[PDB]
Amino acid sequence: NYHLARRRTLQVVVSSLLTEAGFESAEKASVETLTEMLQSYISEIGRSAKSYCEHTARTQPTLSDIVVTLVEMGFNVDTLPAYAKRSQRMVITXXXXXXXXXXXXXXXXXXXXXXXXXXXXXXXXXXXXXXXXXXXXXXXXXXXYQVLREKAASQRRDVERALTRFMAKTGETQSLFKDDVSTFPLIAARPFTIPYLTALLP
C-alpha cells in the first residue's frame, strides 16, 4: 500500500508531460497503462545495463554504456541536448515526499538480574522482571509472642465479661447498690438441694 506513492508520482510526471504536450482531457486507464509502460521501460533500460555491464569484470555502468544501451533500444541521442531546451526549461520540477520519524518512549523499571548469565552472549536486551518473572505471596505475618498472648487473654476477659453480663441480666438478681441493672447486676442465690455433689465435682 505504501509502494503506491512512487507510482502515483510517476503518474504526476506523465500528467506534467501531457501538460507540456497540451492535452486538456485524457482516458485515465490509458494514462495509468502508459505509466506502467514507462516504468517497464525504465526497468528494461536497467535490465539492459545489468546484462550489458556484466560482460566486463567491472560492475559500474558508465555514460558510454548507456549510450550503447539507448542506441540498442532505438533512440537518437543527438536530440538529448535539444530536448533539454524543452524539458528542464519548460516543465517545473515536482518534489518528492517522505516523512519518516522515530517516536520516543520510556518504560524505565529497575530490574535486570542477568546481564550475561549462563547462555553467555553480549548481544541481547533483558527486558525486566516486571513482565517475565514472577514471585509468591504469603501476606500474613505478625509473630509477636507477648502481643499474641495479650490478645488471647483479652479475648478470655471479653468472654468472661460477656457471659457475666448475659446471665447477670438474665436470671435472679441482687445488686451491690440499689438497682445496679447497668453496672453490677450480680446473680442472686439459687439455694438448691444437694451442695456437695456440685461444689466438689472436678
Binding site: X105, X106, X107, X108, X109, X110, X111, X129, X130, X133, X134, X135, X136, X137, X138, X139, X140
Partner: protein, 339 residues
C-alpha cells in the same frame, strides 16, 4: 469434499466482444472451447503466481506478481493475585503518581497506557485510587487531582484493558472532581477550571464506548447535569462543571439543551453582572465561567445559524452574548476561512 467446476464465460457475450471487431457469424462451441482454453491458461498462470508469492511468502497477489509471472482441618494460607515483583512495580506506579519529577511523570503515564494485558494490577489499583480520590476531595489538593485525572487518561488510552466490568467505581470519582468545592485557595481557583475542562474532556472519551448497553452513560449523566443546572442557590463551580460536561458530549447535545438555555443562562449572566453589591470572588468566578461557556457554545450556534444580523442575534441571545458571540462568530468565520 470439493468440486472444481470449469469457470466458463458465457459464449454469447464472447460473441459480442468478437463481433465488436466484426469477424463473422460465429457458432457456440468454438467460443466455448476458446473460453475453456483461455481459462486453462489463466488458472495455470494463477498457480504459477501462487507458487511465486508462497515463495514470496505473502497471501496477497499484486499486479507486479503476475507481471513477473508473465515471463513465458485448617486450610493453607492464601496468596493474592499480585506477585512480589509486580506489587513493587505497583509501588513504583503509585509513588510516580506522587512523583514531582516530570520525567518520572511521563514514564508513569507511558507505562499505564502501554502495558497491554496487565489485567492483574487492575481493580485493586483503581479501587483505592478512587478512595484516594474521595480522601483528597476532602483534603482539597489540586496537585493530587491533576495527577489522578491524567492517570485515568492513561488508563483510558490503554486499549487491551477493557473498562466494562470495572466501570462503576471510577465514573462517580471522576464526576466528584467535576462538581464542586475544589478550593485550595480562593485566588487559586483558576487552575481548577482547567481541571474541569480536562475532566469533562475525559467524559467525552468515556461516553463514546459504553452507552450501547444500559444507559447509565448517556441518560443518567445528562439527567444529573440537567437537574444540577436546575439546582438554584449552588456555587457556580456546579454550574460550570455541568454545562462543560454537557459541552463535551457533542454538537447536537448542546443544540438540544442550550436552545432554551441560550437566553435563560443569559438571564443568569445579567443576574450576576449588574447584580449583587460586593462579592468579588463569586463575581470574577462566575464572569469568566460565563465568558468561557459563551464562546465555547458559540460554534454550536455558528454551525446552526449564519452570522448575519449581529444586533438581532444579540436580541435572540438576550443581549449579553452580543457582541462577544458576534466576535466569536467572526472568529468562527475566520476559522472557516482557514479551511
Amino acid at each position: 469434499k470439493l468440486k472444481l467446476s470449469n469457470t466458463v464465460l458465457p459464449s454469447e457475450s464472447m460473441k459480442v466482444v468478437a463481433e465488436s471487431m466484426g469477424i463473422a457469424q460465429i457458432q457456440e462451441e468454438t467460443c466455448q472451447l476458446l473460453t475453456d482454453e483461455v481459462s486453462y491458461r489463466i488458472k495455470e498462470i494463477a498457480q504459477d503466481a501462487l507458487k511465486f508469492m508462497h515463495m514470496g511468502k505473502r497471501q496477497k497477489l499484486t499486479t507486479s506478481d503476475i507481471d513477473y509471472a508473465l515471463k513465458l482441618x485448617x486450610x493453607x494460607x492464601x496468596x493474592x493475585x499480585x506477585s512480589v515483583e509486580q506489587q513493587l512495580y505497583y509501588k513504583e506506579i503509585t509513588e510516580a503518581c506522587v512523583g514531582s519529577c516530570e520525567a518520572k511523570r511521563a514514564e508513569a503515564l507511558q507505562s499505564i497506557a502501554t502495558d497491554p494485558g496487565l489485567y492483574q494490577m487492575l481493580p485493586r489499583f483503581s479501587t483505592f485510587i478512587s478512595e484516594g480520590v474521595r480522601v483528597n476531595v476532602v483534603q482539597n489538593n489540586l496537585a493530587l487531582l491533576i495527577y489522578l485525572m491524567r492517570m485515568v487518561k492513561a488508563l483510558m488510552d490503554n486499549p487491551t484493558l477493557y473498562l466494562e466490568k470495572y466501570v462503576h467505581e471510577l465514573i462517580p470519582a471522576v464526576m466528584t472532581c467535576i462538581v464542586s468545592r475544589q478550593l485550595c485557595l480562593r485566588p487559586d481557583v483558576d487552575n481548577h477550571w482547567a481541571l474541569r475542562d480536562f475532566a469533562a474532556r475525559l467524559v467525552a472519551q468515556i461516553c463514546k464506548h459504553f452507552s450501547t448497553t444500559t444507559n447509565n452513560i448517556q441518560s443518567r449523566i445528562t439527567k444529573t447535569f440537567t437537574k444540577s443546572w436546575v439546582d438554584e442557590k449552588t456555587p457556580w463551580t456546579t454550574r460550570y462543571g455541568s454545562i462543560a460536561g454537557l459541552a463535551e458530549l457533542g454538537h447536537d447535545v448542546i443544540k438540544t439543551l442550550i436552545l432554551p438555555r441560550l437566553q435563560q443562562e443569559g438571564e443568569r449572566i445579567r443576574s450576576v453582572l449588574d447584580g449583587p453589591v460586593l462579592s468579588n470572588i463569586d463575581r470574577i468566578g462566575a464572569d469568566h465561567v460565563q465568558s468561557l461557556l459563551l464562546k465555547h457554545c458559540a460554534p454550536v450556534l455558528a454551525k446552526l445559524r449564519p452570522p448575519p444580523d449581529n444586533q438581532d442575534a444579540y436580541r435572540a441571545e438576550f443581549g449579553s452574548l452580543g457582541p462577544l458571540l458576534c466576535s466569536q462568530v467572526v472568529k468562527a468565520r475566520a476559522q472557516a476561512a482557514l479551511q
